């Protein structure tokens, strides 16, 4: 029997595990330490959650090591590993409403969005990677022959072993799923550290791995702090790979920690200040819709959000007028209400950061067209915000807000290389976008943009088959697509003489 | 007109550049600083070589950055980049006897071996990778369609940009060539730091890039210290990738330095303590030949050298007797003499380490069968060495010698998993081997060995098409083969809606 | 509602469709023509089955064309096409006992074997290929640039369109499933012609496509004759690809018909006379078990069956003794008896061919060790048979029996190239095997065998991920594995200038 | 010493072999039979060329068989095969002016174009495929394990063996090189049948294989008739693959012949009636230039030539006006004259077809704007032709001219699907094109076009890395790119149990 926090909400009964998940069981942390997880809609405590300690990290890593080396997971056919992962996706689908409701409570995710995206894309992720298991293939290579003898050279793709996954709070289940599905499909075992502020869907997911028959110790989940739990994962001698999504500063520290312990492999999905270039020859009404989505999607808590919009001079004023008209129509409210389309920010400290961010924007001379303030209601709601007259030297032109803040600059009619230079003048390089009907401009701009993803006449169009990752200080390595698997596999070269 | 150190040796007149190579020209280091490079055959000074300073690193990086961003290398077709690399290989082949002679002088490489391997394989590497240029391909991906609209998702493989390559002294030209060929084939530009003790073939290679018509600034070479030049490369804000081969401890420091600066990509080819398991059902005389090669090849200065031989009890004594017979036939001498089998160690400090290494092996109780000492003659020669009765707890069972020291342990007749456990009981995982006529043992053993390469009934059989790289604390990423290209490329995802 | 033949058998009430399946409906053939399908266990008529006419082929092709061009199948996401194929596999699994019972009745497949192989592998096939749908990818290619302009070249993998699949009677559901799964995974629509003698699992499968929600007209099934129905498929102007499995001579005729009509694509999986080479250094008792399986599996009605065993002189007589001992332990009987090892042959004409085949072998001078005739009992049972003293010029050394007839020749101790020559002296090239503990022999022999599949120390080890196809007059193209997809896809090159 | 036809022309002394090339030597045909090859500039006999007989085909195939099975080509490293192919390309480059002059004489190729395309692209082809030799790789596949035992499955890519290549006359050396480069890169040996009317560059190429060190019997060349020499190649029991480029009707017969003999593999590059759709929003002057090229390149003797131009109503009249202006600037003359940009048609019988073609176009009611006739001068020159008011039912809207005949239809402004239907209403599907500045229209039209190549805002942009082949009755299989290799390789699956 598992201990649950039970809650009647959104026409169902939530049964939320709140403990550490280690070696297939829910257990208290060392000293039965706990912390509170906070509902961003009203600021209330949802429940107490176990607070993992160093010795809990060591127990989780040991369980994952044992599951990998001696348990069933390291012994079953790749095809049968695939079947378990497909069954896990099915179990997630069976609990889709519950998962989306937990995400709404824990992260402020608008329920209809959480169903489609946070949860829906997570289900797709597991199904996609389940199909890879028995399709991961090595090679045979026509090497020079040691005549008069013969040689055969092949490669074997093998799992890396025990992995640690450390993730942020913006899409709790979805970030977990992106990384965990690739990690498990490759035959690894894993210890996951969800963001401290958003533990709940990760813990429910953990229970779902039991319903799906994932062998004990294959998945271990440790709610707790990055400075304690995430640090120990990066330091651990039995951990062989870290997959990390989060800020550039923490990413630097993770990579350093991997080096200093045992040169464990690392992948980094870091910040972004992604440019969206909107040309005068675009479909303007569609540009408004997609440009708004590029910023405001999931209350701006979106790693690939456009952190900068460059709008061609001749359409700039009309674009801004139309954005303001649409912003006024947005319904801000409880994420569980079906008419809501703008939920609360994830947690209080982040709301504070956004308020301060917009103060700095105003202070430095940018024009606040709308928003900029907390919404006067319970919880941590922030107004969808538009800045214009943004100049390249400005703080808000350089720093990632991670909030619903549209940051608009003009560029001269007929400029292309000049706007590209400005769009590329960042140490980030996660995503980017261009709206234009001109094929030649679209293709040229996509070539020249220094970003891991370039959207053309769309935005936020991720897909489980399409690799996602940054350039420059946005990191390296891919989540999603075949490419993601390479972070979780090692290649053994075997060379025979006969 | 280039300044050379001219030397008449080996029936040739060598013309050796000795300066820094920056932006297509040989130039003195800042303050005209120099150091001596030492011939290991007699301990003499070959010549003075420029000693690169931090400002020289900055100049090299600036030249590499300009060559990539604005120079011809970044504008030519992939096919034509390929042609230039194939021309470079032809120029290397035209200069092959000279390059091999320089390597004999600088590294103590036996001339006949240097022709075939140090230089021969370097030529193969550039020809192999030249072939990849116009065969590096991205993907088109069947993503979910945003109905009633359509989507197209493709990926583009792009160069990473400015790279730094840092290499060791055991195969100076060959290590340079492995990493440099892959780096340039992927469209990058490069700053290379050869090991301070072995700069000469790198600098002659620099001149050959001019003869081949490689655009100025594409290749820059900086003889000098790792703690100055290599460090600045790892720290530099304009360098986007480091490719490193060397020790595990320096690798840790490089990875840390990559993290703390700009999260530049890193790949690491580190040390090894590679096991070779010899079963009683092997071809014994072949096992003796290949077993000796596994240790003694290139005077043991060989990152994949077998650092432990486990020999089945019933053949152990006969194997050792046969090895001693063959060891006594090895001809030690000047690398330029055609009858030489065993050249001098690379430099004096390494010879000293080898002497100390074998003192400790004797102290801790292993049986010294032969060698263990500096050869009484000028230069830095070391006697091919055989230890037996080696136990798992011993220093020489754990530490990489990087010299011609065969380190033998027994295992009980029939004891497959037990010997595997002992072979895998290391934090290294670079290479490994198994000698057996039994197909079932060979396949099982190669599955169970925790190493990036497994040789079966052979050893030292590398090939430019076969990826080479370690597991665990031997690092990550591959040199050679298609897989090497992935360290030098980035993937851009481009997603259209229409 | 669908009309069924109902049969209370094997603890089940079978519900067997017996009509043509066209455009998602079970329909009578033109003029309500029918034929009898015969139970090989007792020679009884199972039921009457619709006999497709030319006008029925035209209707099926028209339904497939409409389904491809205008129906849902041509519009849904690849991922969602995958979901439907997964669901079809689940539906087949839910009906697995019924399908295996139908196969026992219709083909004489031993029920326990039919569950595991005929049906179980069919389920694996659909699940495997379902995973490929959204992982079928094209390329982006670094072509030469039309300077001062730019070029982008990509490829798109597209379905071929309407396909015809023509199959034999030995594994009715499995052969259908192999080809159909790959065909549908690639986005095509299909008209299937099962062998006239074995229509029933194909028709039950058709019904299962309805339960799975496969759109109308995507799958059409036409029981009837090859010379009428199969011919019209190969001739049809709207069919773009034929996938064929059967005899070399029909294959030739099919390929000719494809040529003369509209040069539709063709793949051919034809006969075999597959050699199994058994060396004296093999594990003898395992060689007997696997050697017997290589011949007797599925009553020898197995395209990859070993049609000759070459057994090394020193073990030949012991091998034959052990085979005879084991043959005598085989239980012959009703496919539904749970201890049956050897079921009846598929139909009466095939039994008669096997009697004649063995008369011919004795006449021409081979030694009949055991078997060679019909088992006296109702139905069409043939004795497991062993021939020795088989010489290379003999009819039975050249002709495929497609029955449970082990055909043994000696080869000389210590010869390898000579036995290889004999094993390769056939115009077939489908499969082959080698039993030896010697790694060098195993690898050399696998290089030298002229056959699409080589088994090493096993036999009949097919796998849905491992491509299966012949060389020489065994045909071309693969079933199973990623390679199977290529027969069902076309490549469009799209080249932009911008 | 080789017998040459010597010719002082184009400031060169041509040395042209004229005999069969068999087993590394130039030899007379059976009975010393010969035929005349005709210069299309003036109708004169260039020289007599050996006329291959059936016994000569058998000698060629025997030489290819021996070279493959026992000669050096079947024994060397893939890497060294690559080196030989690279060397071949270098030799071709050393003879480029001579090859281009021979092609001008034999095929009427304008010298400047023959240098850049006929010859230049052939050189690129051999270099490109030389790079593939040691990069052709098989797989290791994670199959289900026969527990308690283990399984390893790998694939080996092997050569198909002796190949026959049959090619047309429009780009004699280039069509030879496309197919031969891929064939040889895959490790095969070859018998080549050039078009009877254009034997000379093939025979010179044969001599260049000697200069390059290609082993005897690897390349064999048989000038002669399709109905005799080509037929015997397709029939031969020792030929295992035919690569064919030519008409759909000869393709059908070749494929039938492959079927009826030994089911040899076949690829077919057949005719085309390729549509070019020109939208009103295109760059009109560039559309004229590229539209001109699409039709008139290489005097229309171009398999991918646009066979119909569909021009949007609102720009149609202006397009035609601009085309006529450009047509009038074309200089018709001797291909060796530097100012010539329109050479003669290849041979007399082709000229006669073009004359009849345009008579029929006029008869059926199309508007003949200009040309349509043989130019009054010696040789076989044809006036660049423009037809307008072409309706879909007309012969010239359906049938491939293969001459310099622009065939223009209108479509209504704003129609997209309607013009696509018309463009796709053909049994051909080789190439196609769209000109438009609208990204959405370009991507949609490229999806919907039923052709193996789609050009966007360009035409005739082939590349050695970009696969080229037809759909429907334009055949199957690719020349060029990685995909071409698949026609010349077979896959062997090797499955171990251990
Ligand atoms: N898809 C492509 O890549 C491509 C490229 C270029 C051209 N083509 C097509 O080629 C056609 C123009 O050439 P064409 O009309 O001269 O071609 P064709 O009549 O089909 O001849 C092509 C080749 O086939 C040979 N041939 C004739 N009968 C044969 C037989 N029974 N068995 C074996 N070979 C036989 C011919 O020999 P002879 O010398 O005796 O005629 C010639 O060498 C056009 O339709 C064009 O589109 C296609
Ligand atoms: Mg934070
Ligand atoms: Mg050192
Ligand atoms: Mg039959
Ligand atoms: Mg013709």
How far does the centroid of ligand 1 lie from the alpha carbon of residue D192, in Å?
13
- State the catalytic residue, choosing from A98, A103, A269, A301: A269
Q: Which of B103, B303, B312, B487 is catalytic?
A: B303
Catalytic residue among C98, C103, C207, C269: C269
User: Which tokens hold the place of B147?
Assistant: 């109905």
Element (H, E) at C192: strand C189-193
Q: Does D142 touch chain B (CB under 8 A)?
A: no
Q: Read out DSSP for A155-195?
A: EEEEE--EEEEE--SSSHHHHHHHHHHHHHHTT-EEEEE--
Tell if the CB–CB gap between A494 and B453 is shorter than 8 Å.
yes
C321 is in an annotated binding site: no
> Do residues C191 and C163 touch, judged by C-beta distance below 8 A?
yes
Measure Cα distances from C382 to B318, C81, C358, C387, C405 in Å: 57, 44, 11, 15, 10
CB atoms within 10 A of CB B389: 13
Which phi and psi (to 5°) does residue C358 adopt? -75, -35
| Count of Cβ atoms closer than 10 Å to residue C322 Cβ | 18
Report residue C387 as tokens: 């021939």
Query: How far apart are the C-alpha atoms of A455 and A434, rounded to whole Å?
Result: 6
From the CA of B270, which ligand is nearest?
A: 3
Deposited resolution, Å: 2.0
List, as ranges, residues 239-298 from D with C-beta within 8 Å of A.
none
**Contact with chain D for residue B149, Cβ under 8 A:** no
Write the burial class of residue C148 (CB in 10 Å: 0-12 exposed, 13-18 middle, 19+ buried). Answer: exposed
Q: Which chains touch B (3 or more CB pairs under 8 A)?
A: A, C, D
Q: Hey, how many other C-beta atoms are within 10 angstroms of the C-beta on D213?
A: 12
Q: Do C454 and D492 touch (CB under 8 A)?
A: yes
CA D315 to the chain's CA centroid: 33
Interchain proximity A135–C135, CB inside 8 Å: yes
Out of B240, B461, B467, closest to residue A155 by CB: B467
Q: What is the DSSP letter of C332?
A: B
Q: Is D50 helix (H, G, I), strand (E, B) or coil?
A: strand
Which residue is closest to C145 within chain B, CA to CA?
B77
CB contact under 8 A, B140 and C156: yes
Instruction: Report the topology of domain A272-463.
Output: Aldehyde Dehydrogenase; Chain A, domain 2 (3.40.309)
Cα–Cα distance measured from residue B275 to residue B414, given in angstroms and rounded to the nearest whole number:
18
Residues on chain C touching B439 (C-beta within 8 angstroms): 436-439, 442, 456-457
Rounded Cα distance, D200 and D214, in Å: 19
- Cα gap C188→C476, rounded to integer Å: 20
Concerning whether D303 is annotated as a catalytic residue, the answer is: yes
Q: Helix H segments across C300-339?
A: 313-327
Determine the Cα–Cα distance for residues B170 and B298; give it in Å rounded to an integer: 8
Equal CATH topology for C6-271+464-498 and C272-463: no
Nearest Cα residue to D210 out of D91, D103, D98: D91
Q: Which residue's CA lies nearest to atom 2 of ligand 1?
A: D269
Other beta carbons within 10 Å of C392: 12
Q: Which residues are bridge partners to C416 per DSSP? A: none
Residue B366, preceding peptide bond in cis (omega within 30° of 0): no
CA distance A148 to D134: 19
Q: With an 8 Å Cβ cutoff, is C79 touching chain A?
A: yes
Alpha-carbon distance B131 to nearest alpha carbon in chain D (angstroms): 4
Q: Is A303 considered catalytic here? A: yes
Q: Do D132 and B135 touch (CB under 8 A)?
A: yes
Q: What is the dihedral of CA B242, B245, B246, B252, to 10 degrees?
A: 40
Nearest to C341 by CA among C302, C381, C380: C381
- Nearest-angstrom CA–CA distance, B487 and B165: 12
Query: Closest ligand 1 atom to the C-alpha of D231?
Result: 32
Where does A28-68 show beta strands of DSSP type E?
A: 34-38, 45-50
Which residues, at least 6 apart from D36, have a Cβ–Cβ distance to it below 8 Å? D45, D46, D47, D48, D49
CA D290 to chain C, closest CA, distance in angstroms equals 11
End-to-end CA distance of chain B: 58
A50 touches chain B (CB under 8 A): no
Q: Give Cβ neighbours of residue D147 (< 8 Å, ≥ 6 apart).
A: none
Strands A241-245 and A25-27: unpaired
Which one of the listed residues C301, C303, C312, C487 is annotated catalytic? C303
Buried b (16+ CB within 10 A) or exposed e, D307-316: bbbbbbeebb
Q: How far apart are CA A446 and CA A436, in angstroms?
A: 11
As a whole number of angstroms, the distance between CA A183 and CA A163 comes to 8
Beta carbons within 8 Å of A330's beta carbon, 6+ residues apart: A296, A341, A342, A384
Q: Which residues of D403-440 are buried (b: 16+ CB within 10 A; e: fewer)?
A: bbbbbbbbbeeebbeebbebbeebebbbbbbbbbbbbb
Q: What is the CA radius of gyration of chain C?
A: 24
Cis omega before residue B148 (within 30°)? yes
Residue C165 bridge partners (DSSP): C192, C243
Chain B interface includes C437 (CB < 8 A): yes
Distances (CA, A) of C168 to A30, B280, C119: 65, 50, 16
Would an 8 Å CB–CB cutoff place A80 in contact with chain C? no
| Residue nearest to ligand 1 atom 16, measured at CA | D168
Strand partners, D411: D312
> Nearest CA of chain A to the CA of B88: how many Å?
21
To which H or E segment does residue D475 belong?
A: strand D475-476
Q: Say which experimental method was used.
A: X-ray
Distance B169 CA to ligand 3 centre (A): 9
The closest alpha carbon to D103, from D2, D194, D233, belongs to: D194
Q: Dig out the tokens for B133 from the structure.
A: 């240029």
Structure tokens at C481: 């594995």
CB-based contact D218:D84 (threshold 8 Å): no
Q: Is D270 assigned a ligand-binding role in the annotation?
A: yes
Is-contact D432 D275, C-beta < 8 A? yes
DSSP assignment of C121-173, as one string? Answer: HHHHHHHHHHHHGGG--EEEE-PPP-TTS-EEEEEEEEE--EEEEE--SSSHH
Provide the 10 A C-beta neighbour count for residue A338.
Answer: 10
CB atoms near residue C363 (< 10 Å): 9
Structural tokens at position C89: 């596999």
Three-state secondary structure of B460-474: CCCCCCCCECCCHHH
Is-contact A103 A44, C-beta < 8 A? no
Which candidate, C206, C238, C212, places its Cα nearest to that of C22? C206
Ligand nearest to the CA of C230: 4
Of the candidates C236, C245, C244, which has an alpha carbon nearest to the alpha carbon of residue C264? C236
Judged by a CB distance cut-off of 8 A, whether residue C432 touches chain D is no
Longest dimension (CA), chain D: 84
Chain breaks in chain C (C to N over 2.5 A) after: none
CB < 8 Å to A446, chain B = 492, 494
Beta-ladder partners of A159: A489
Q: What separation in Å is there between the alpha carbon of A348 and the centre of ligand 2? A: 12
* Closest Cα in chain A to D456: A439
Query: β-strands A12-16, A20-22: how paired?
Result: unpaired
State which ligand 1 atom lies nearest to the alpha carbon of D250: 20
Q: Tokens 């769209």 correspond to what residue?
A: D434
Q: Which helix (H) or strand (E) holds D234?
A: helix D231-235
For residues D5 and B95, give the distance between their C-alpha atoms in angstroms, rounded to a whole number. 41
Interface probe, candidates C240, C304, C493, chain D, greatest D C-beta count within 10 A: C493
Nearest CA in chain B to D129: B131
Residue found by looking up tokens 């690559």 in the block? D82
* Cα–Cα dist D164/D239, whole Å: 7
Q: Which residues of A touch B455 (CB under 8 A)?
A: 495
**DSSP conformational letter for A438:** B
Task: Calculate the CA D127 to chain-centre distance.
Answer: 18
Rounded CA-CA distance D223/D46 in Å is 15
Q: Are B361 and B394 in contact (CB under 8 A)?
A: yes
Chain B residues with CB under 8 Å of D137 CB are: 482
Element (H, E) at A5: strand A5-9
The beta-carbon neighbor of D139 closest among A77, A139, A438 is A139
Ligand 5 centroid to D293 CA: how many Å?
A: 23
Class of domain D6-271+464-498: alpha beta
Domains of chain A by residue range: 6-271+464-498, 272-463
At A59, give phi and psi (nearest 5°): -65, -45
SS3 track for chain B = CCCCEEEEECCEEEEECCCEEECCEEECCHHHCEEEEECCCCCCEEEEEECCCHHHHHHHHHHHHHHHHCCHHHCCCHHHHHHHHHHHHHHHHHCHHHHHHHHHHHHCCCHHHHHHHHHHHHHHHHHHHHHHHHHCCEEEECCCCCCCCCEEEEEEEEECCEEEEECCCCCHHHHHHHHHHHHHHCCCEEEEECCCCCCHHHHHHHHHHHHCCCCCCCEEECCCCHHHHHHHHHHCCCCCEEEEECCHHHHHHHHHHHHHHHCCEEEEECCCCEEEEECCCCCHHHHHHHHHHHHHHHHHCCCCCEEEEEEEHHHHHHHHHHHHHHHCCCCECCCCCCCCCECCCCCHHHHHHHHHHHHHHHHCCCEEEECCCECCCCCCCECCEEEECCCCCCHHHHCCCCCCEEEEEEECCCCHHHHHHHHHCCCCCCCCEEECCEHHHHHHHHHHCCCCEEEECCCCCCCCCCCECCCHHHEECCECCHHHHHHCEEEEEEEEEC
Q: Ligand 1: which residues within 6 Å by Cβ? A: D 166-170, 193, 195-196, 225-227, 230-231, 234, 245-247, 250, 253-254, 269-272, 303, 400, 402, 430, 470
Q: Which residue out of D163, D282, D303, D358 is catalytically annotated?
A: D303
* Locus of tokens 């009877």: D196
Q: Which tokens hold the place of D193?
A: 């049948």
Residue A246 annotated as binding site: yes
- Chain A CA closest to residue B238: A472
Name the CA dihedral angle for D82, D87, D90, D92, rounded to a multiple of 10 degrees. Answer: -100
Instruction: Report yes or no: A440 at the C interface, CB cutoff 8 Å.
Output: yes
The span from the CA of C143 to the CA of C316, in Å, is 60
Q: Does C131 touch chain A (CB under 8 A)?
A: yes
Compute the distance between CA of residue A101 and CA of residue A105 in angstroms, rounded to an integer: 6
First to last CA, chain A: 58
Could you tell me if A491 lies within 8 Å of chain D, comparing CB atoms?
A: no
Which tokens sit at C391?
């010489």
């Amino acid at each position: 029997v598992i201990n649950y926090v039970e809650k009647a909400v959104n026409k169902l009964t939530l049964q939320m595990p709140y403990q550490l998940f280690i070696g297939g069981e829910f257990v208290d942390a060392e000293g039965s330490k706990t912390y509170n997880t906070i509902n961003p809609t009203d600021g209330s405590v949802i429940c107490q959650v176990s607070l993992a300690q160093v010795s809990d990290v060591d127990k989780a890593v040991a369980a994952a090591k044992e599951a990998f080396e001696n348990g069933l997971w390291g012994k079953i056919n790749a095809r049968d590993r695939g079947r378990l992962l497909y069954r896990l996706a099915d179990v997630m689908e069976q609990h889709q409403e519950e998962l989306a409701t937990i995400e709404a409570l824990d992260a402020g995710a608008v329920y209809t969005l959480a169903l489609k995206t946070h949860v829906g894309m997570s289900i797709q992720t597991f199904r996609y990677f389940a199909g890879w298991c028995d399709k991961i293939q090595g090679a045979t290579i026509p090497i020079n022959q040691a005549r008069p003898n013969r040689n055969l050279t092949l490669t074997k793709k093998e799992p890396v072993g025990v992995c640690g996954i450390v993730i942020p709070w913006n899409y709790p289940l979805m970030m977990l799923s992106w990384k965990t599905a690739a990690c498990l499909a490759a035959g690894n075992t894993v210890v996951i550290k969800p963001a401290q502020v958003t533990p709940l869907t990760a813990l429910k997911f953990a229970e779902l791995t039991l319903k799906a028959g994932i062998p004990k110790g294959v998945v271990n989940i440790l709610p707790g702090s990055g400075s304690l739990v995430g640090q120990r994962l990066s330091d651990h001698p039995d951990v062989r790979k870290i997959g990390f999504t989060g800020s550039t500063e923490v990413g630097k520290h993770i990579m350093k920690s991997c080096a200093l312990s045992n040169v464990k492999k690392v992948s980094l999905e870091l910040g972004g200040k992604s440019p969206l270039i909107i040309f005068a020859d675009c479909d303007l009404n569609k540009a408004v819709q997609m440009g708004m989505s590029s910023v405001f999607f999931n209350k701006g808590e979106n790693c690939i959000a456009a952190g900068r919009l460059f709008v061609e001079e001749s359409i700039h004023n009309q674009f801004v007028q139309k954005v303001v008209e649409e912003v006024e129509k947005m319904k801000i409210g409880n994420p569980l209400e079906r008419d809501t389309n703008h939920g609360p920010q994830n947690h209080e400290a982040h709301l504070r950061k956004l308020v301060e961010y917009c103060q700095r924007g105003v202070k430095e001379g940018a024009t606040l067209v709308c928003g900029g303030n907390q919404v006067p209601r319970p919880g941590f709601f922030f107004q969808p915000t538009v800045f214009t007259d943004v100049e390249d030297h400005m703080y808000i032109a350089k720093e990632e807000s991670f909030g619903p803040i549209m940051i608009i600059s003009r560029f001269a009619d007929g400029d292309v290389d000049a706007v590209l230079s400005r769009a590329n003048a960042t140490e980030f390089g996660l995503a980017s976008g261009v709206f234009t009907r001109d094929i030649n401009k679209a293709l040229y701009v996509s070539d020249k943009l220094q970003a891991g993803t370039v959207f053309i006449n769309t935005y936020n169009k991720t897909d489980v088959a399409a690799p996602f990752g940054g350039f420059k200080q946005s990191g390296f390595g891919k989540d999603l697509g075949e490419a993601a698997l390479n972070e979780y596999l090692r290649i053994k070269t075997v060379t025979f003489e006969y």
